[PDB]
């Protein structure tokens, strides 16, 4: 517990500790059982064997601490591939609700960096598991093996860069759709303006309740117009190509 707390969560530091203990054991290797100095005889082999057993047991149990977050990385593998299947089957150039599609496009650009991070994590994981088989690990049946996940992850990356890029270049249609949407929004804003100066109930002869209802209708449609304008602006800035 003390050494684990001192190390904390660090896979590379863990591998450094593993190579340190491995080289310490390698240096410890010896055949003599008694170190003779003058007429003095000292037992050396019994404690040697006991502490070699100590080294072996501690090294073995330290290895067991690693099977956990590897399970975490396989869970990451699954959450990537299973969700990505539906995500790649989801979007298309049509379905003018593309404000959601461009949201997913921004999501996948944001996840490019996470994909790179997970790739270097997979590199560290493959080094660690290589250590694991050269440390004679009995592979559990429910353990998901390295080559399966690496192959399916490479396939995931290939499909992602094959399809998500393609749908990204053909955006000029989406660009002109956003253009016509925003010019319609501007026209509606000008119309709402003209309606505002025409509708000014600032005169007090009007009944407060009826003019209040009229202003409530105007404010409902004006909130709708503001929602349209803000959603067009957010779609434009998320797509960020126009």
């Amino acid at each position: 517990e003390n050494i684990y707390n001192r190390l904390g969560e660090d896979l590379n530091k863990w591998q450094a500790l593993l190579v340190q203990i491995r080289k310490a054991r390698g240096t410890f290797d010896n055949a003599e059982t008694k170190k003779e100095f003058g007429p003095v005889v000292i037992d050396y082999g019994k404690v040697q064997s006991k502490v070699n057993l100590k080294y072996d047991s501690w090294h073995k149990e330290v290895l067991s601490k690693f099977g956990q977050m590897l399970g975490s990385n396989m869970t990451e593998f699954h959450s990537q591939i299973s969700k990505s299947r539906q995500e790649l089957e989801q979007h298309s150039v049509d379905t003018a609700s593309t404000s959601d599609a461009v949201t997913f496009i921004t999501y996948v650009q944001s996840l490019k960096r996470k994909i790179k991070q997970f790739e270097k994590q997979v590199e560290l994981y493959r080094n660690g598991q290589r250590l694991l088989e050269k440390q004679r690990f009995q592979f559990p049946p429910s353990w998901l093996y390295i080559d399966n996940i690496e192959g399916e992850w490479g396939a995931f990356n290939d499909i992602m860069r094959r399809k998500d890029s393609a749908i990204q270049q053909q955006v000029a249609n989406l660009q002109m759709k956003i253009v016509q949407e925003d010019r319609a929004v501007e026209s509606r804003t000008t119309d709402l303006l003209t309606d505002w100066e025409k509708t000014k109930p600032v005169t007090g002869n009007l009944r407060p309740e009826e003019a209040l209802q009229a202003l409530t209708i105007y404010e409902g449609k004006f909130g709708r117009l503001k929602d349209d304008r803000e959603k067009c602006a957010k779609a434009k800035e998320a797509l960020e190509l126009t």
């Binding site: 050494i3 530091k13 450094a16 500790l17 340190q20 203990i21 310490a24």
Partner: peptide, 14 residues
């Protein structure tokens, strides 16, 4: 390197 050595340097008492 070390680490395994440096952790061993904080023996509790004497």
């Amino acid at each position: 390197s070390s680490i395994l050595s440096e952790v061993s340097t904080r023996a509790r008492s004497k």
